[PDB]
Amino acid sequence: FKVSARTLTGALNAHNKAAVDWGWQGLIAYGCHSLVVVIDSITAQTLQVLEKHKADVVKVKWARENYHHNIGSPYCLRLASADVNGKIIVWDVAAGVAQCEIQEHAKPIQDVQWLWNQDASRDLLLAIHPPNYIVLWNADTGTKLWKKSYADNILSFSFDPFDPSHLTLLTSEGIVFISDFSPSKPPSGPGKKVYISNDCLQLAYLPSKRNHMLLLYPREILILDLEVNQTVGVIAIERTGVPFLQVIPCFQRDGLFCLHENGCITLRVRRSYNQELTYDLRSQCDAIRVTKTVRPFSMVCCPVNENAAALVVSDGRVMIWELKSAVVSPLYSPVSFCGIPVGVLQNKLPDLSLDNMIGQSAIAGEEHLREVHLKFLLTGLLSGLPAPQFAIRMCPPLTTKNIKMYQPLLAVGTSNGSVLVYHLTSGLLHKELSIHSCEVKGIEWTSLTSFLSFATSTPNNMGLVRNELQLVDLPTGRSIAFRGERGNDESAIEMIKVSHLKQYLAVVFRDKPLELWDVRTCTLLREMSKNFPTITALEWSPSAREHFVFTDIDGQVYHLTVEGNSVKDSARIPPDMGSITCIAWKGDTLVLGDMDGNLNFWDLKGRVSRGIPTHRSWVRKIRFAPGKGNQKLIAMYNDGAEVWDTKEVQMVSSLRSGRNVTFRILDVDWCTSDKVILASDDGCIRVLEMSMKSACFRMDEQELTEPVWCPYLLVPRASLALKAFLLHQPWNGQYSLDISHVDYPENEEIKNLLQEQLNSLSNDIKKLLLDPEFTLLQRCLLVSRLYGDESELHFWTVAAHYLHSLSQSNPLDICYDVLCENAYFQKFQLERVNLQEVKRSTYDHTRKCTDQLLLLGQTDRAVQLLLETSADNQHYYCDSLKACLVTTVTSSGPSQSTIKLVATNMIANGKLAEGVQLLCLIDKAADACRYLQTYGEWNRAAWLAKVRLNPEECADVLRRWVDHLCSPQVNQKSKALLVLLSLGCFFSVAETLHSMRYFDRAALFVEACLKYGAFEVTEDTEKLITAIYADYARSLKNLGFKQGAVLFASKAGAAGKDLLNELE
Structure with a gap:
């Protein structure tokens, strides 16, 4: 039962309204009070938490992946965050360590966004510095490139998806257009400025229609045409409706995702079947409850498939929605599945992506068919810790008499009246039970599966307070009263103690004598007389004769013994310096806490005292460390916590709020013999080491209940090998998805990691992979979709469409423009x-x-x-x-x-x-x-x-135009490749792909062209094919994959004989 250091998040803050992003890697990241949390959508579980910022996080943006991936540039996770203090941190989320620090001035960062043009460099970042400063940063070394100043107040900016040299700005006066954006020189002049005829909510471009952007208003949505500077489309809600809050456009299909003030999400698709642009509502979700304390912040959508949406609300709840299709303006099914048309007897997955649910764009009123209906379904829900002022307690320590059934459970009390049960191993919330109707004051355990808790009601004008005591058994959830029906007219309860052997119990009131109870029998034993000193602190003796000691308002120490019903007195101690508020006992050492901040180390072996002032304000509670011969205590003060030693009086480590740590401490406990648990005031629970030194949590060593499909967490040598294995499915005759059938001489740990990554795939994906009629192009498209990369995603669709068109209306979507x-x-x-x-x-x-x-x-x-x-x-x-x-x-x-x-x-x-x-x-x-x-x-x-x-x-x-685009001063080879593919010149495409050291995309293209009959193996085209095969075989050999290497070397011919001479 190993326990690893981890932190638990709770509610959100007002500064985290717009701190969320859904990247192409498949992970969702949102900003906590001062932490960044990364969670998954398929399994809905927290994976990694980053804690280095000293202020609130305002912006979180994932990195862009629009470049070729190889050994030099492997698949890695990169994150960028900004804070209120004006610091930008570049994250590498695989171990918890940062790579770059950027800070300028002491003002909050208003907008952060990466650059999608990564043809030359993939480490460019642009951020807005208030009030009128825009700076282009470098994510590799943190070196400034250029700085430009304006004469307005910039609010937000967006990039042109089609022209990298176009950039626009949103100011308090109007809109500023920039047409000379370049990473080499700053903009020349202020640019063209226009005035709208102040209360704009959002400004973004339209990735489906060129030279189109939208302006967001609470009651209207405007579509603007650039070359005329006129509105061409208005989306308005009815007279009695909920005002808009946020809008997110789509790329694969012309559609918009709209978020309302009540938490509702609507999807609108452009009308194409039976003058201004009209968007028709298609799907709607169910609104959530709205309260002055609970409200939605923002929503995100999947940028890869555009079929899932995530909503973040203020209380820490994450809702994941999914879009489903089933068989106003009508809509029809797509003709081509996975890039190529299919028949009526092949397996289909309409829910794989948005483009597989609806057809392409069309003009209404033109002569031309299965109806498609879309609906929203909720399939995910994540919850966090409730409001501050927790009340925590730890399970009984692990002894050798209960190793078989020991479980490190944690009980947390909240003000709602509920108790949370955690596991602390996997980090998942075990159980949540509603017990009391008011704030929970204390939690104490009576066994490994039961605990006790008490609460008090609001006092009246006299002081009498209703008292509640409930006994809860975790597996069954039953709650029963302990004392019974004592009415609602009694004094309140300050503290309750359970002895070491879970035998007796004591209840302490403000002005009522002490009472002794029995856990097993649940009957009263003895009630103290009226002439009894007032109780201020009590503690048992971890040594059926059991001992407990207590002090009074004067300072006298009273020692009593209990045995059945008879209770006797042991001895007395002379008064000693002010009033004691906490007592801890373990072994032969007794420690006393005072108001002034003094700790008396009484030892019942030699009658000696050791008063060591702490120079602090006040002591709240002290507790010892579990375990025999473990003489260590943790002391909680009004400003922090300290760890002491009762054998040698010497402070080991301290944590003071304001000097060393930024948050406060509300409760302390002992997780294990070497770890402690700290409760923070912002709604966070942290498990730290001996010195409470922040560590770097690494995803490599983390136990997960459900496997997560994420190739980025693997080593660089494994992701490419897995991609090669998946691409060439028909290995040695049969079809299989396990590593142990193909020759691959590597270590066992990485093989097991690959096997468990493969075992986490969906059933439908696995069935599609195990299909003899699933062609190579569809396999490549599926691999590109799974890996989350954009370059191959854009390349393969166009390549397959043009290959199928030229091999033999199903037209290409207008989102490609000059490629249609x-x-x-x-x-x-x-x-x-x-x-x-x-x-x-x-x-x-x-x-x-x-x-x-x-x-x-x-x-x-x-x-x-x-x-x-x-x-x-x-x-x-x-x-x-x-x-x-x-x-x-x-x-x-x-x-x-x-x-x-x-x-x-x-x-x-x-x-x-x-x-x-x-x-x-x-x-x-x-x-x-x-x-x-x-x-x-x-x-x-x-x-x-x-x-x-x-x-x-x-x-x-x-x-x-392609030749011009290949100039070194432009560096736009991807667009040249796309235009060359559109021109139907496959040999030139293959030659230029081989010239750019793309050893896999060229081999796959050659194989696809040979299968589809684009060019034959003549006396002139054999050399290029042989060279490409040899290069791909060498690349596969360099990765340790011998099966593919020998397979391609066999087809290489006379230029792979030397490679085969060393392979075998």
Whole structure:
């Protein structure tokens, strides 16, 4: 029965309103009063608690994982936190030790967020320093990069998911836009500022629609369009409804998660089946009770599957919700499962992720099917310690007569009237029972499965107080009265004592004589007479003759003996210095505590006293350490606790509040012979060592009732090996998920760790893995989903979709933009320009709408819009001439040389937009795209090539864009890879993947292409395949996995013979 040091959390504080985050690793972290707690959602149990901050935690943000993982960059957990004092700590949650400290000024940190662009460096952090300072930090060495100051009060900021160089700020005046964000130089100027026409609640971008963001209001939700700076969608609640509190967008599908003031969560999905954007409510949960002391703070959602939500409320309760599908605007099931379409006889898992529950986006009012209904279910619940002022007690110490059934139980009393039972080994709450109707004053144990507790009611105008005494047996939970029915007119009870052998019991009142009881018989034995000294302290003798001693208000020490019903007196002691408030007895030493702060070390062997003043204020309670020959006591004062020694008088360690520790001590106890338990005033219970020195709790040595699936807790050499084992499932004929069938010469401990990690997977995941018809692409997608990585998650979906499309409507979702088809993109652009045209307001918008329509191909509706300029505007002649020209220039065969010359001259002189517009207007978009690319506007050129142009001319433009994206001054290789995959050039993708030392993603891509028939093994393409196979085999050999290494070396051919010469 080993006990490890640990801490237990309770209620939350007002400063922890927005301290919670759900990262891609699958763990949820929230901020306690001064601690960070990491919990799991699948099993709902606490895993690791971090305690180093000296102030309240205000922000917790998980790290981003958008980079290739290898030996140099293995899978690790990284956390960042901020406090009120203005300190930022970078955490490595595997042992409890920090890696970086950042502090500037003495003001609270208002916003912390990582950078998603990790192509070059993955240790960049941006934080806001009040009042107008923004600093970009480094998470590796804590070195400042640049500092920029503004002339406003920045509240929050968000990053553009599509353009890394775009950043926006929310100020008390308006919104500030930055378009020159870079880690090398600070922003040039203040940027473009606009004024909204103060009480905004949230500002975030929309990851589903480009150039879209939302503004949160208590009664309204606004969708804003960037290129027109106009509202295109309003989400409003009914007249009698609950105001909004928070909103969280989604990426896989166009949806929003909304949190209300009453604790309700609603899901809204964009309408696509039967002018402004409309979001229809789909699912709703059940509201929780709202009280002046209990209120929800904020909610989080899973960023990987977007099918689970977590809610945090003030009292420490965590609720986990799940979204389920079953078979207003209708919704239909997806066509492709795990990246590829499936039939009607294969196993399916619609609840695996959100994208597998509903279909892709569509335009309402267009000609086109199983209905899908979504509902919310509560499957998790976590509870913590109640309000402060606990009352704790420890189980009887472990002797050699009860080793078989000993269990280290802990009893904690609260003001609600309930008693909490803990285990202290696994850390889980064992039992919770409601006993009393008022605050519990004391808890004492009578056996290993029973204890006693008492409570008092509110005194009246005279002083008489109702007394309650209940005996509780833990396995059954029964509660019965001990004294009986004594009425509600009696004096209160100060203290109760149970003898060492659990035989007798004493009850002490304010002005009532002492009473002696029997635990087994539950009958009275003897009641003291009226002429009895007042009781101020009492203690038994841990030595059926049992002895107990007590003192009076004067100071005289009285020693009495008990044997059955007869009670006699032993001896007397001369008075000795003020009034005694606590007595402790063990062995032959007796210790007395006084008001002034003096401890008299009386020893009943030589009649000698040793008074050692503590120079403190007042002594509350003292208790000795369990165990024979263990002469140690802990003394509780009004400012802290101290550990002493009764053999040699010398203080061992001290803990003073305000000088050494930041919190107070409300109760002390003895867990084991070498550990102590301290109760804090903030609602925390800590188990510390001899010196009460804070330790670093490590997740490696921790016993858990239920295994937790987390590859990040394993060694770097194990996660990659497990990934390789899972990817190539068909080992040596049969299918199995145990290590002991494949050749893998490593130590037994890591093998057992891998086996227990595998055994914690869900039944449906295991069944999907054990499917002969589950193709390699689906396996790769499932592995990417399980590991929580984003790079492969984005790569494999697009790769599989394009491979299946080219091998042979199911279109790609619009969340990829330039990675979609021409017609699907063109339809969305037409819808967007129609929305823009609907809500034109002034002359500064009609011109822009006409310009957009003149490049989207609409020629008939642009002439009519042009013929509307007023007769007083100075541009009437220009607009009329342009309209007439557009009407008469519909011929493209003859008389086009001079028009092209004029366009080229206008482009050369500086006017580029007009020249490009005219060139696209007459007969040519490729030349306009070339000129746009020459001047550095790559995004508009790519958009133009996607809208117009045949799929034979856009290929060259996109290849040039990819080549530009590969420049060392940009470092955007992932986007170039995605565009190359969209272009259907698999050989170039494989070559550039091999050039970037991606030894696994290239081999998997080659295998997938060979299976799907993209390129054959000819006399020219065999060298690259052989080199990739040899490199992957070497990489697998470097990890200790010999089976995959030899399997790939066999297929390598003539470049793997040397590797096989040393493998075997």
